[PDB]
Amino acid sequence: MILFDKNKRILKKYAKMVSKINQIESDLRSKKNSELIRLSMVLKEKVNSFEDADEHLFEAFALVREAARRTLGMRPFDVQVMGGIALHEGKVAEMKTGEGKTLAATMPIYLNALIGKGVHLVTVNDYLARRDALWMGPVYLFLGLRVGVINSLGKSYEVVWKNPDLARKAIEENWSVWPDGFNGEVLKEESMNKEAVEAFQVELKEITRKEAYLCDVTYGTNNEFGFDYLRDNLVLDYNDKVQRGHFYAIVDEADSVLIDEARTPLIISGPSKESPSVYRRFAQIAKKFVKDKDFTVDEKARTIILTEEGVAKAEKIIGVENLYDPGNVSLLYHLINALKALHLFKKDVDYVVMNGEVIIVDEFTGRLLPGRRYSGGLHQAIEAKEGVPIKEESITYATITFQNYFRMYEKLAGMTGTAKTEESEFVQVYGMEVVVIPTHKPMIRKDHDDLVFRTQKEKYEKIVEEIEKRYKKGQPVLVGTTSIEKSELLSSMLKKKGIPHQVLNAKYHEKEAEIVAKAGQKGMVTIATNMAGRGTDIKLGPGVAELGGLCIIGTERHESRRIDNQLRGRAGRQGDPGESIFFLSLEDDLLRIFGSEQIGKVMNILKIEEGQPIQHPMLSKLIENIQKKVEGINFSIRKTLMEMDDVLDKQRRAVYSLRDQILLEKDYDEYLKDIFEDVVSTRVEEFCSGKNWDIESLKNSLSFFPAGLFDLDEKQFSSSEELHDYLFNRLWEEYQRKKQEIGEDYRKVIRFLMLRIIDDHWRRYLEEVEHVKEAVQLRSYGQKDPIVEFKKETYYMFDEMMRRINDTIANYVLRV
Amino acid sequence: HTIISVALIYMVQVQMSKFSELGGAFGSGGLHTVFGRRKGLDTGGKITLVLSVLFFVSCVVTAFV
Amino acid sequence: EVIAEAKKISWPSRKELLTSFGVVLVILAVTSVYFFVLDFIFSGVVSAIFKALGIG
Amino acid sequence: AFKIPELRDRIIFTFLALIVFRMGIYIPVPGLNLSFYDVFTGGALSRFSVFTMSVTPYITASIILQLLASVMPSLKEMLREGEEGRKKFAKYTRRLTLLIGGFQAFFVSFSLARSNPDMVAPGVNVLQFTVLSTMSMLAGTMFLLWLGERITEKGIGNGISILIFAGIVARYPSYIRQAYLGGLNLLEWIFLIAVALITIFGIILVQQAERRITIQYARRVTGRRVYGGASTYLPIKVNQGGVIPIIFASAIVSIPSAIASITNNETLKNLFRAGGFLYLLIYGLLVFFFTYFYSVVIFDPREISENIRKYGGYIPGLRPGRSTEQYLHRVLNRVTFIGAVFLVVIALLPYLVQGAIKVNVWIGGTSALIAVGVALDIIQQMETHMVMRHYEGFIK
Ligand SMILES: Nc1ncnc2c1ncn2[C@@H]1O[C@H](COP(=O)(O)OP(=O)(O)O)[C@@H](O)[C@H]1O
């Protein structure tokens, strides 16, 4: 039962659900205003629980679409209608242009939210969180709900301002001048008496984490959503409504929801005891590698070391010790650090905003992420390479953005995609499918091949003249570059040849705004990074599309087939034409280090002597295979931490689920003591017989406290576990309440203690979990290869972990 | 002429099966190692499976008895 | 000299063992019990089959 | 108890396994089984087959990619890629051994069908009992293959084979044809046991390793760390010869012997036990050295000393680069020497006790080395599934 037999069987399935629901919208155009409001109340109490109220989805969705028609157009296509359908099911309708991802989403988002639980709506970035947030905000105040979006450090979500605005649409609800002249998806521009009043619904006020989530819909970015989830850790107070239950979610541009391989870790408190050292130390460090040349072999992954001149340098500076390894790698660490710093990551990708002097990282498909680092050595390394040096190096928690998160609870339905690349994925983890649908007018846009050029980005030069020829013909163009550097030079190029343009390459945020509508306004020229050229309700002004419609020049082909296409797809919304073209150099990057060994012979032996335009013998063909190839590597590494972290999902669970129960409950007294003793007592009877010197000695190390309790008191043979247990138990319980003398406030003491102490231990031993990741880098040879050694060590450390807790957490409940 | 016609058919059964593995490798690889849960509850191609085992117990009664 | 060397360095290299592999031996036997046990199940059930679809 | 139930997969594949094999052997059309080493091995060419062609194309399959990828590394696009290249390579493996099993099909069917004892194989030739056998052979390969995969979902792709060994090694100890010479001197069973212990030894090879950690994904994004731990655990990586050693080499020697028994008009001359010691040592150089060489993949230091790694074993390690492969090369061939001592001593085991009273019934050495092999591997199935949850068990 697996073929088109499935894709098509899906067709009729929905072609049916749609026919019925289509009739629903038909007999409802009765200008249902106040009555519709009543319908918002009707459905409201029609579910109140995830009982999967199917029938509702029919009359409700009907109300949805129409609800839009009243507030703002854009709602007559089907892959959006059918979208929400399959969406509510958990797969992926769509593929872009017209369709309705903005509106579509709103459809199922409505039914599900009704539960009163709060639904998730993943989106790649902040700017976009705000996007959908308002683009559909209307229908929400219409269906009386509370939007809810979270971002970087602050969060907001709302409808029109104060009281007048409400008193503006309240009656205009009863009024609502619009239902007339319909019968056609030709949503033109008019009815200003409606827009000028309702369209101004887009407004936002400041709120906080709590009301945010518990509100209705929750608009946010995975980066954030993840961090929120984890924010739920060192929460001495559970009153912190930090995220109200995690479960359902629809992914806006899920073609990325997956590519978020690198885990989601909130890292922050870094108590550097060697901060001043790092300062001076790292200064010397960085300069050290400066002392050495190119030869240091740095490629195919961010790991590096150098041969001859390397060992040479090692000895050449602070360390006449040849044999450096002897538990003396701490220093070599310093070298590798700077080494990798000054090279692995161009300081120009870990930029310094306008004299903010802060070395921030805008890397990893993002767009400027304030104060933070992906590691405990890079931040301080490059810092040593620039100027102002920090003193942080912290960890805390981690998690897989998807399976560990989403599969932790409920479902998902992505938007766009199609390639087989995603189905196997949407299986091995998420557990969804695909519903490829071409809305009115399919792939109406034009595309052009991967025109290649040799020896250096000198092709990017040829693409310049290209942007020109377009400009003259009055064509609105745009380019999708790779990084910030190349992006800049790009502009400089247009300037050196005199060409107006705007650059939204994470320069400034405000830029992203203006450019929103200022990107493609007849002949307009715009250059931006893929981080702004991935899914966007872009449009176009006047005649604009007069010829071609839109033009897109790609600076190269990303690390993924989809992404490549994405940057391109940014030319086609609502269902209009356009033009795309890719300029690639056999000395670009994608193949400068990936597949270079292949392209080498296949080229220098095939042909070398020529001009510039070429792609007749295996060029676009070969590179293609390389692309998928690279993606493959990602797929591979995707495995390593995915599988591992899975075993971590278990451990982590017990972790703060325990920190939860301790935060909630009260007198775990008899428990903590008991388990503390049984653990410490069996200790006095596990690796040390309860004889005399045997125990007194080993147990001494087991009982190293400034306190005094039968320490130097020997001569005892009455140790049948019962006797020994009561002895220390009373020293505790008694001296406990006796020490409880402090006051009722003593209750919140274990609070600070338990959590912090527990949190502390865990996160610490998590540092060790990374070293264990090295042991799994060992399994490769000898024993099997299915995460074995890791699982067996993950628990070894897990048991060690806990017992450790009880010890420290214990003595801490005293010295005060 | 059941054994002759169904014979050519027995070979057909071999096709749908040799392929079930070829394509059935989104978590299988010879001596690979993937106890990959979160996926797997009686393949939609298990109809082929039942068609197979049933096919040979079928050649049992038809061949001799 | 030659082969001597190989043996001289092998004499001390003899490591990576398991003093409780005897525990593993006890299991090896258990495992064997499984094989035999399995095979014995055959004879019994296969013989019920021997009567039916065998000497019919 | 000792079983300590929980294993929701154990008895599952176990019982399921017994089922598929019953119908599998008594299958219609072939089911062949329901100069002394030749008439004891059995077959048309050189393959012991409890069934037409299922366990044969099995060993065949494994062999196909074995020597292929062996002497010939990368000739056609695929090597190792963790997932992508591994599947493309696996698919090629599929079609590969498939057509191979076909070749052997037509052959074995021919010879068999017209010259073996306890025939009862009719002569109503219509579809050729060769195309008919080709059926139960190719199709037969499928039922066993298909079964294998599933077996490899709860047990092991070799769990099907151990079922065969289980059966074979259980037919002879229940007195099926072993009481005509000897008997009541069952020390031979206990001695075989001593061999079992030897086997276990092989496993822990020289298992030892280095340091450092790192993980690179996406496009142009990764990280790094310092030092300040406080735990147990360390680095492990060396090894020793894998599975099917003595068996692969021993079968080879049986080849020049069989042909030497039936060349032109049977040039009957000696080559049975006498030249043993010589052919036995062959098992040493052949198996151990050749495999262990490729086996301990010459390129290990490349990856190790690449992600930044200076080993620590048998003393605080040091020198990086290929020089590391040098130090390791030593431990490599040395532990291999020792390995030979034991495995080779297995075939030699019966040879060292059969010096006073020799039994022309060696049936038990090779087959055992196989049956135990899968036993040990299944022990790995339990090694992982074991240890439920050690947290809170006797703590908070
Ligand atoms: N039903 C519709 N009616 C009018 N315009 C629509 C409609 N659906 C899609 N649009 C047009 O297409 C653009 C893109 O739609 P959207 O739902 O954001 O999908 P994508 O993410 O593929 O652009 C919208 O900004 C709008 O201009």
Ligand code: BEF
């Ligand atoms: F909202 Be769309 F997917 F750009």
Ligand SMILES: [Mg+2]
């Ligand atoms: Mg959208």
